[PDB]
């Protein structure tokens, strides 16, 4: 009876936060288990900071943003907000809400205000691990990469400006560590990643011959692989870093192309989806493991990467299927 209004990963990805019109609920990504439940009137979008005690969401009743403590049983504070939430992201440190057309940002703590004046952007934004990435206003397949800089006159701050496609950016995905960001166009056509000290591009991949919008991108735990989901429903896995390459090693001849390297991915997995789910995001279990959630059906599939050693070759695996509830 209890529809999912908004879900999302932690930042670990070690778990699923999700509300409905009833309540609120932390589950534990794999194994799948309810970690607790809260009863909740109109909660909107809702974000998670790490396994800490604080949780963000977004009354769909009114303007308001509710910063909810759980020892307590409270909100420490509600943030008056000027339009619709598209985004939100938390940190230690930060708060970042992307609603309508501006991007906001306020103080973490006392007395959680505003430190900085809204950022205007074209739709698309992420933060993660102190770094911002945002769409332009204007040219919709340009970037902006900064950090946010919590000691200094002056948090801003810097940033750079990346074209990172032709046409308009779909979504952006940064990794773990933040140094890379892997980026999406309405094309769906190809992946690109850029490295967030200058903006350079790293790697590019093909995704299909056919324009397809993409749901969903994931960086692996070790950052060297990148799993994609299509509306074409197929799961696609990159190898961005083997291990040498991962691990900054010094490569003997990299000059030469060597490698003129990979360009596809290494694995699909074409998924059955009902006429019914239209979105769903990726987590990593593990770094050979995947989940995927679906909104609508409240389901979880578990996926198993596997290598075969003597051919150099992966393959995609479904081990298991679970409601939510």
Same mark, same amino acid.
């Given at each position: 009876?209890?529809?999912?209004?908004?879900?999302?990963?932690?930042?670990?990805?070690?778990?699923?936060?999700?509300?409905?019109?009833?309540?609120?609920?932390?589950?534990?990504?794999?194994?799948?288990?309810? /970690?607790?439940? !809260?009863?909740?009137?109109?909660?909107?979008?809702?974000?998670?900071?790490?396994?800490?005690?604080?949780?963000?969401?977004?009354?769909?009743?009114?303007?308001?943003?509710?910063?909810?403590?759980?020892?307590?049983?409270?909100?420490?504070?509600?943030?008056?907000?000027?339009?619709?939430?598209?985004?939100?992201?938390?940190?230690?440190?930060? =708060?970042? #809400?992307?609603?309508?057309?501006?991007?906001?940002?306020?103080?973490?703590?006392?007395?959680?205000?505003?430190?900085?004046?809204? =950022?205007?952007?074209?739709?698309?934004?992420?933060?993660?691990?102190?770094?911002?990435?945002?769409?332009?206003?204007?040219?919709?397949?340009? /970037?902006?990469?900064?950090?946010? !800089?919590?000691?200094?006159?002056?948090?801003?701050?810097?940033?750079?400006?990346? @074209?990172?496609?032709?046409?308009?950016?779909?979504?952006?995905?940064?990794?773990? @560590?933040?140094?890379?960001?892997?980026?999406?166009? !309405?094309?769906?056509?190809?992946?690109?990643?850029?490295?967030?000290?200058?903006? #350079?591009? #790293?790697?590019?991949?093909?995704?299909?011959?056919?324009?397809?919008?993409? =749901?969903?991108?994931?960086?692996?735990?070790?950052?060297?692989?990148?799993?994609?989901?299509?509306?074409?429903?197929?799961?696609?896995?990159?190898?961005?870093?083997?291990?040498?390459?991962?691990?900054?090693?010094?490569?003997?001849?990299?000059?030469?192309?060597?490698?003129?390297?990979?360009?596809?991915? =290494?694995?699909?997995? @074409?998924?059955?989806?009902?006429?019914?789910?239209?979105?769903? @995001?990726?987590?990593? /279990?593990?770094?050979?493991?995947?989940?995927?959630?679906?909104?609508?059906?409240?389901?979880?599939?578990?996926?198993?990467?596997?290598?075969?050693?003597?051919?150099?070759?992966?393959?995609? !695996?479904?081990?298991?299927?679970?409601?939510?509830?």
């Amino acid at each position: 009876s209890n529809p999912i209004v908004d879900y999302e990963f932690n930042q670990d990805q070690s778990c699923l936060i999700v509300s409905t019109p009833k309540s609120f609920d932390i589950y534990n990504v794999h194994p799948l288990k309810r /970690i607790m439940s !809260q009863e909740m009137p109109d909660a909107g979008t809702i974000r998670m900071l790490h396994r800490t005690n604080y949780i963000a969401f977004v009354s769909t009743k009114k303007e308001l943003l509710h910063i909810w403590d759980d020892v307590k049983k409270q909100d420490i504070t509600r943030v008056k907000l000027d339009a619709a939430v598209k985004d939100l992201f938390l940190s230690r440190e930060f =708060i970042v #809400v992307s609603q309508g057309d501006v991007i906001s940002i306020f103080k973490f703590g006392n007395p959680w205000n505003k430190i900085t004046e809204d =950022i205007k952007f074209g739709g698309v934004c992420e933060f993660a691990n102190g770094l911002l990435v945002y769409s332009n206003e204007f040219n919709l397949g340009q /970037i902006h990469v900064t950090r946010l !800089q919590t000691d200094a006159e002056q948090v801003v701050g810097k940033g750079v400006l990346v @074209k990172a496609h032709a046409n308009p950016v779909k979504m952006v995905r940064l990794n773990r @560590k933040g140094d890379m960001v892997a980026t999406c166009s !309405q094309d769906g056509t190809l992946i690109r990643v850029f490295q967030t000290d200058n903006g #350079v591009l #790293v790697r590019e991949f093909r995704r299909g011959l056919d324009r397809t919008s993409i =749901i969903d991108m994931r960086w692996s735990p070790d950052g060297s692989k990148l799993a994609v989901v299509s509306d074409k429903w197929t799961l696609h896995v990159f190898e961005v870093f083997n291990d040498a390459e991962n691990k900054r090693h010094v490569l003997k001849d990299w000059i030469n192309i060597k490698y003129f390297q990979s360009e596809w991915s =290494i694995c699909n997995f @074409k998924l059955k989806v009902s006429k019914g789910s239209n979105d769903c @995001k990726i987590a990593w /279990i593990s770094d050979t493991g995947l989940v995927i959630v679906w909104p609508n059906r409240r389901l979880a599939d578990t996926f198993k990467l596997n290598y075969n050693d003597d051919e150099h070759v992966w393959w995609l !695996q479904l081990n298991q299927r679970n409601e939510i509830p």
